[PDB]
């Protein structure tokens, strides 16, 4: 998370780290006691379910309830050469037990809407600037959803924004996702104090630069996919 602040214990209990050979590659987020959601590009190069692990809490290096990946499922239409269809699910070989630190997030119904000046949160153990290293401590940032129209300016991102993608950040930059944050959550809280998964950190030019916000996979667009694959 660019210019990201340290997240408190138990603030984002659905947040997970995905490690390949005990190195952090990517975020995920919990949706059941067995299943997580993340990006497809996380498994671009590292394709062995059995060398992936998952851990929770605010801290990688002293790992919480580390777990082994039974399997992962990537979107049929994802292709490493393009940015569309960037979603995957991950099932863990042992169910995990919900504490104050570890809990499942809610998924939105397929047709929920999110007014495009809405305040949303974004978290991950990724880099603090472009080309920086991952942190062992989870970080957060408050950004805002951004109109597809704004976003689809040729000055911004143009025709690279395809269905199932949306933007979030600030046109003034500073706060953003960075490398190591992909597959991790973009969330909001309804007025009944319940948190919901709206986005999955996907891509972007640099980190925290004017007119270069993050691009997220749009959960509501892939909501039926997730259901078919998880039963959630």
């Amino acid at each position: 998370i660019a210019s990201g602040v340290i997240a408190p214990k138990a603030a984002w209990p659905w947040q997970a780290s995905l490690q390949y050979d005990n190195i952090h590659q990517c975020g995920a987020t919990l949706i059941s006691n067995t299943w997580l959601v993340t990006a497809a590009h996380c498994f671009q190069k590292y394709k062995n379910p059995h060398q992936w692990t998952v851990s929770f809490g605010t801290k990688i290096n002293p790992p919480l309830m580390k777990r082994n990946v039974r399997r992962f499922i990537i979107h049929e239409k994802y292709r490493s050469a393009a940015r569309e269809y960037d979603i995957a699910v991950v099932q863990v070989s042992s169910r995990v037990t919900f504490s104050d630190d570890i809990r499942q997030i809610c998924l939105p119904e397929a047709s929920a809407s999110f007014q495009p000046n809405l305040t949303v949160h974004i978290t991950g153990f990724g880099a603090l600037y472009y080309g920086g290293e991952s942190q062992n401590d989870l970080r957060e940032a408050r950004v805002k959803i951004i109109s597809d129209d704004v976003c689809k300016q040729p000055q911004v991102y143009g025709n690279d924004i395809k269905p199932g993608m949306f933007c979030a950040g600030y046109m003034e930059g500073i706060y953003d996702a960075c490398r190591g944050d992909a597959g991790g959550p973009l969330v909001t809280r309804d007025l009944k104090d319940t948190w919901y998964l709206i986005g999955i950190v996907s891509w972007g030019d640099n980190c925290g630069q004017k007119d270069k916000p993050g691009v997220y996979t749009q959960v509501t667009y892939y909501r039926n996919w997730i259901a078919s694959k998880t039963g959630i």
Partner: peptide, 13 residues
């Protein structure tokens, strides 16, 4: 329950 956090958003300074 899903989507519940037990720590406030409103933090001590």
């Amino acid at each position: 329950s899903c989507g519940k956090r037990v720590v406030p958003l409103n933090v001590n300074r």
